[PDB]
Each structure stands twice: as C-alpha cells, then as structure tokens.
C-alpha cells in the first residue's frame, strides 16, 4: 500500500498523487518468516522499505554470539547503508513474520535524488536519528543495569510497534525470549530474571510474542 | 585565519568535500569563545545547532540518578558535539560543558541548508560521511556488546588516548591542565568506575603518570 510507503523516509509526504508513478519503479518482494535477506559480509547495493512484517538487524561474535541493534517495521528502510557507502553489508538482516518489502539498487535511488534535494534531506534525517540511538544505547551499556536497559528497550518497542488496549500498551515486537535478551544486548539468564521481576511487580504482562505494559510509569523510572 | 581553516577542515562533517566548498561554509561561520564551566547546551534544550571546536575540550554527559552526570566522551580541536541535531532537530540527548576555555564555530540548520542549496553534490558525500560513522559506531557498540563489564570501559578510556594522544615511542602522549578537583569534576558519577579501570591499567604497566601529562601504551 502506498499509504505505508508515503511514511517511508525517502518519500514522506512530498507528492499529492505523482507519487504512484515511481512506486511501480520498484517491483515488491515477499519473504517467508524467518528468512535471511542478506548476511554478513555479503557485496550489496540493494536497500528494502518494508511494506509489512518485521525484520532484525544482526551482529554476530567471533564466538556465535549474536547481538540485534534494532527491529524494522512497516516503513522502514533497511541496507541503506552500503547504498550510501559501497562495501559489504556489516550486518544482517532477517526476517521475523512474513514480510512484504519494496526494493531499489544505488543507482536508481541517485536518479531520484537529481531532481529532488528534499529527498537527501530525510535520507540524513533518518541516518542522524539511527546514529544518535546507537549512541543512546552505548551510553545505556555503560551506565545503566541490566533491568533498566530491559526496562528501556521494552519501552522503545512500544514506541515504534505499541497500541492501547484499554488502560495498557500491547505491545507485538514479534520476538523469541532469546531474541530480546539479544535486542537488549545482555544475557539471557538477566534478561528473563528482570522480565520477570517486571511481572512479579505486575507492570507487565508477558503473552507469547507480545508484552503487554500495566504500569510504563514505574518501568520508565527504572530505566532512569 | 591560516591555521584556524586546518583545524575546522578536518570536521567529520568535511571528509571527502571539495576544500573550496569548506571554505565557503566556514567563512559564514561565526568564531565564538567560551569560558571554562559552560554549559553549551544541556540535556533536554531545544537542539539545532552543531560545533566545531577549534581549540580546547569539552566533556558530553548524561544526568545520573546521583543529580551528577556521567562522563559519556570529550572532544577537542577538530571534533564536533552537537552535529546530529541539523540533520534531525529535537531535544538534545546529552549536555555538552566546557573543560577548558574554548573557541568553537557553529552551524544551524538554515546554514546547512543553504551550503547544501547551492552544492547538490555535498548531499551524497553527507549521506555517505553518515553512513560510513554508523557503520562504525555500530561496530563499535557490538564490540563492546561482546566485551566484558570492566573491559567496556578500559575499551572506552583506550579510544580517549587514542583521540586526545601524541604518538610517542609507541605509546600515547596526553597532557592537560586540569586541577586534581577539576579531573574529579570532569569524571562526576563515573569515578568509581572510571577509577577502577585507572587502577587496572596502572597495576598492568599500562599507563605512567609524568605529572600534568600520562603516558599510555597503544
Ligand atoms: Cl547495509
Ligand atoms: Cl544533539
């Protein structure tokens, strides 16, 4: 749908109706759950804006240790940044639903910027914001415990993915339990022993692929 | 000025931009001076205004649950603080407060702009200069992600010697003029942390105090 799309950075409430007539300059890609759209390491120069479905962005150790610096959604763009800077891909991206994405190679994103600057504009918007939260994190890995940056990530998922249901925040992150210890970047053992204390505490309510949040006054304060 | 055009063009901001194109961006910028123990901006303020230092150092901290603030990184000469509100204007995330007297050059969003209005070509290489830093700080997060509690901040104090050093028989050279109170001052709720990684490093013949100047191994 073009109605997600125009929430996308590249073109984000620019064009009333020509903006149909270069959404059909991208074929859509559909993606099983659970599908690596690109590894490590691998050449690329292909950047994705999912139309629905998640997908997480990976790092994995030396050691078979995996980290997941953030979850993209409806939206968002994603292998952007060997378009902007030839090179392998750094990280991997996998799919976590079924994901429906729209896709574009370098050269066909520079032809749609030649006319239009403002698209630029919100390409360094949206780099600006992911650097500024990679920050935010480094700063949370040094100085904050290990339940306040739970605390702190079940927060930003209901940023991006949380609806209201009644006097809560259901929030779908679509998430195993390892995979939101690998979110906030600390064991499993940790995670699950502050995700259960939140529970105990009765702030949230913790439902399969979803959590829902009582109580985001005394989380935020915990993650201060 | 000379040896003030070096200084602001080597910015992360410039890499790969065509060098009369720095200049007639600097050119529009206005030198200013700050005093030592000034708050440049705060955690919370409104943000659209980036720096580039010229000389001096400033600190960039978070507020802690102590009302002091943790020590998140310094800069000095040729570094920016404040950059990533002209490209996404907003609160600002971290303070920024002066350790030393300071003379710095700033830019808002409406001096960018119109830089960029001019020069369409400096939009790819910005895209480009922001995405080759998230690849890196993000390599860098991992990396830490992966390292131990004590380790993360050894790693941190490492890529401090590495930015503010002289190279010197292999080690690294940093000198100050910081009182024993003004180093408290500077480290605030990190002391004891900060402290312990110090002691490490000491115990380990990794570091040698030669007065108001260390002396740390790379
Ligand atoms: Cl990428
Ligand atoms: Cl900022």
Redesign the interface.
Known sequence: MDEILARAGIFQGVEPSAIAALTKQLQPVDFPRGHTVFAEGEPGDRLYIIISGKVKIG?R?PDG?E?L?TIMGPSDMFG??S???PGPR??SATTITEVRAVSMDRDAL?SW??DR?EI??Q???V??????R??????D???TDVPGRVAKQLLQLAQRFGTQEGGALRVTHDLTQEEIAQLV?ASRETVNKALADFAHRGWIRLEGKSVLISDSERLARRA?
């Open positions: 790092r150790a240790r980290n610096l952007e940044l378009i902007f800077d750094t990280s520079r910027i030649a600057p630029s504009e390409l360094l918007r780099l600006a914001r992911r650097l500024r990679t920050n935010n994190n480094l700063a890995l040094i100085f970047g201060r």
